Write a protein that binds this DNA or RNA. Sequence first.
RNA 1: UUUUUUUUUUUUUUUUUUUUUUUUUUCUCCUCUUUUUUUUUUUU
Length: 51
Amino acid sequence: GPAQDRGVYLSLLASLRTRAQLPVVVFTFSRGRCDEQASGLTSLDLTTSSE
RNA sequence: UUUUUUUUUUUUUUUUUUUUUUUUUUCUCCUCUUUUUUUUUUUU
């Protein structure tokens, strides 16, 4: 769902950032919805202030 | 619920020269009447 797919995004990006496999590649199969995935999350901040 | 790939505006430049206005035709051709020829001279 529109508000439940975000739940999937914040589920997979939760049980994987704790461990060492934080670099992740998502193979979206559409040029259109690829930007839609990133647009509707808006909060990951997975960067240190030095980098 | 619609991915991936399909080049672009020709290359070249560091060659010598010792002439001179023009330019080229037109043929022979009946002259009518007072004359010898007047004349110095002086006033500029």
